[PDB]
Write an enzyme that holds these catalytic residues in place. Structure first.
Site, PDB file in Angstrom:
ATOM      1  CG  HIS A 160      -1.854  -0.044  -4.710  1.00  0.00           C
ATOM      2  ND1 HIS A 160      -2.423  -0.986  -5.544  1.00  0.00           N
ATOM      3  CD2 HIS A 160      -2.867   0.462  -3.950  1.00  0.00           C
ATOM      4  CE1 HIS A 160      -3.723  -1.062  -5.290  1.00  0.00           C
ATOM      5  NE2 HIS A 160      -4.007  -0.189  -4.333  1.00  0.00           N
ATOM      6  CG  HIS A 220      -2.144  -0.988   0.760  1.00  0.00           C
ATOM      7  ND1 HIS A 220      -2.297  -2.229   1.366  1.00  0.00           N
ATOM      8  CD2 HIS A 220      -3.159  -0.866  -0.138  1.00  0.00           C
ATOM      9  CE1 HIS A 220      -3.371  -2.817   0.855  1.00  0.00           C
ATOM     10  NE2 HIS A 220      -3.873  -2.036  -0.097  1.00  0.00           N
ATOM     11  CG  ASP A 230      -8.297  -1.332  -5.062  1.00  0.00           C
ATOM     12  OD1 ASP A 230      -7.096  -1.092  -4.985  1.00  0.00           O
ATOM     13  OD2 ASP A 230      -8.958  -1.555  -4.039  1.00  0.00           O
ATOM     14  CG  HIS A 275      -7.463   3.787  -4.336  1.00  0.00           C
ATOM     15  ND1 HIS A 275      -6.319   3.926  -5.078  1.00  0.00           N
ATOM     16  CD2 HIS A 275      -7.445   2.521  -3.833  1.00  0.00           C
ATOM     17  CE1 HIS A 275      -5.624   2.802  -5.016  1.00  0.00           C
ATOM     18  NE2 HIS A 275      -6.317   1.923  -4.314  1.00  0.00           N
ATOM     19  CG  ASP A 276      -5.333   1.919  -1.058  1.00  0.00           C
ATOM     20  OD1 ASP A 276      -6.374   1.711  -0.335  1.00  0.00           O
ATOM     21  OD2 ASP A 276      -4.881   1.082  -1.859  1.00  0.00           O
TER      22      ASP A 276
END
Ligand code: EPK
Ligand code: MG
Ligand code: ZN
Length: 318
Positions: A78, A74, A224, A114-115
């Site tokens: 990514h 993460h 994802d 998004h992360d």
């Protein structure tokens, strides 16, 4: 030499076999900023939204630097990978022919953030250790809510859309949030069932914003978890990285008597088995529905790579 070849790789940013690892190496760890800046320009967004390029680069940099590079999986690479995949899906004819510059703008920002600031451990871990995030978000999509509010803090801080109406800025925040929250894999059954119904009914109307945003949410869920839909050489690296991060959470749970989470125990789980069950139960169902929506070469290619990568992992067993 290295700044040269990076420029050259971006000519192929719409390719499913793009190599984000080499890209990040070539850019000294600048893949997310460099890739996304390029896509903003490629999709015409800098002109469409009168964006200051100095503020754009600053915003993209604050995003990239707010990933923990020390997470095996993460981290900003990514994020950059998910953004490149999202870009490939936005190029699919049903999306290319209905999305607006504003949709493209939100989809890329949501993929990129998004992360954001992911701590490298999962939601049940944050809950059982009483992490402040789990309280802040009442045990519900704790990670995704965090990524989203972190992204809204960077949007506000950067001033990138300061020249747009307040109501537009708020709507941007809300629609990005609905995209990021769709990435909470623990709620996949709800998104996939809703999607599958619409697809059974045949009632999706892509010039309706609500329908088109449900599709974009499905596109981001695909982006994802599309690692197994890549080439074997790419997918193998992602699987090693994802497994390393899971096994690290397991070592902490073991060392501190926290209870070892499913998939996190290096003594009873393998990389191959973890991939195989993930492919059967999460990746194939999502990508098969996706291939009903967008029945193209890309969707077939993606699913062929899953079947192939799955046979490789079985091969590497006994
Ligand atoms: C694509 C990277 N990725 C993700 N991404 C999730 C974290 C979004 N999840 C998993 C799981 C998994 C299996 C079961 C339940 N929750 C996660 C097994 S392997 C694997 C994986 O390679
Ligand atoms: Mg996530
Ligand atoms: Zn992710």
């Amino acid at each position: 030499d290295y700044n040269g070849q990076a420029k050259c790789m971006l000519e192929k940013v719409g390719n499913w076999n793009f190599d984000i690892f080499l890209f990040d190496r070539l850019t000294n760890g600048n893949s997310l900023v460099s890739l996304t800046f390029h896509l903003f320009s490629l999709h015409g967004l800098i002109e469409y939204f009168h964006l200051d390029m100095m503020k754009l680069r600053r915003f993209l940099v604050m995003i990239q630097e707010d990933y923990h590079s020390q997470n095996p999986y993460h981290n900003a690479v990514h994020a950059a990978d998910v953004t490149q995949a999202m870009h490939c899906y936005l190029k699919e004819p049903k999306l290319a022919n209905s999305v607006t510059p504003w949709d493209i703008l939100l989809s890329l920002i949501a993929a990129a953030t998004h992360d954001l600031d992911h701590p490298g451990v999962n939601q049940p871990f944050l809950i059982k250790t009483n992490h402040y995030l789990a309280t802040l978000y009442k045990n519900t999509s704790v990670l995704e809510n965090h990524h989203w509010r972190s992204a809204v803090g960077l949007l506000r801080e950067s001033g990138l859309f300061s020249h747009l109406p307040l109501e537009s800025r708020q709507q941007m925040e809300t629609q990005i949030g609905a995209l990021i929250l769709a990435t909470d894999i623990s709620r996949q059954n709800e998104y996939l069932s809703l999607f599958r119904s619409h697809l059974d009914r045949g009632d999706l109307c892509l010039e309706d914003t609500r329908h088109r945003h449900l599709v974009l949410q499905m596109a981001l869920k695909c982006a994802d978890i599309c690692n197994p839909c890549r080439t074997w050489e790419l997918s193998k690296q992602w699987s090693e990285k994802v497994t390393e991060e899971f096994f690290h959470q397991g070592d902490i749970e073991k060392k501190y008597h926290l209870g070892v989470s499913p998939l996190c125990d290096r003594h009873t789980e393998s990389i191959a088995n973890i991939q195989i069950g993930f492919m059967t139960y999460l990746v194939e169902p999502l990508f098969t529905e996706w291939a009903r929506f967008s029945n193209t070469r890309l969707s077939q290619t993606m699913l062929g790579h899953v079947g192939l990568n799955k046979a490789s992992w079985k091969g590497l067993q006994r």
